[PDB]
Amino acid sequence: EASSLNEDPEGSRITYVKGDLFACPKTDSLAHCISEDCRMGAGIAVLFKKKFGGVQELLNQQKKSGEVAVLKRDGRYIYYLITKKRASHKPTYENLQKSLEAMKSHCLKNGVTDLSMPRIGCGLDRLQWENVSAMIEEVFEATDIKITVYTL
Question: Active site residue: 18, 50, 74, 125, which one?
């Protein structure tokens, strides 16, 4: 009986958690950014690669950059924000903004109010998180969904 759960929100839309992204609470659905081409050679998608192995599930939906591909297992929905076309494509605010719109509106249809995502975007400071965090809240306005960001 040793289970240290990190249920620690309440502050703003976004709450930052340092820890494992898969150690997220069962009530929380999970989101992150991927390419529409879904070639996963890097990113947190490679972790989902072993965990859910739903690359084809995504591609069979055929989403474009600006849309979100969702995987339902049970309890939580996995949000694959299609942020960029090719895998080496780098996220844009508007593309990410669109994936957030898609994602946030979907949560309403399912009754999702808890979401967890890692360091979304890509390994570039070209997008400034200050704009990202604001944009998330700007998109999320009028929702009741929490945002839990795991830092990596």
Answer: 125
Separation between Cα atoms, residue 36 and residue 129, nearest integer Å: 22
Query: Is 124 flagged in the annotation as binding?
Result: yes
Kindly provide the b/e burial profile for residues 74-95, where b requires at least 16 CB atoms within 10 angstroms of the residue's own CB: eebbbbbbbbbeebeeebbeeb
In a domain, 112, yes or no: yes
C-alpha triplet 110, 32, 29: angle, nearest 5°: 30
Task: Tell me whether residue 30 is annotated as binding.
Answer: no
The answer to whether 47 is a known ligand-binding residue is: no
The amino acid present at 40, given as its one-letter code, is M
Question: Is residue 37 among the annotated active site residues?
Answer: no
Torsion angles phi and psi, residue 139, rounded to 5:
-75, -45
Method of determination?
NMR
Range of the domain at 111: 13-152
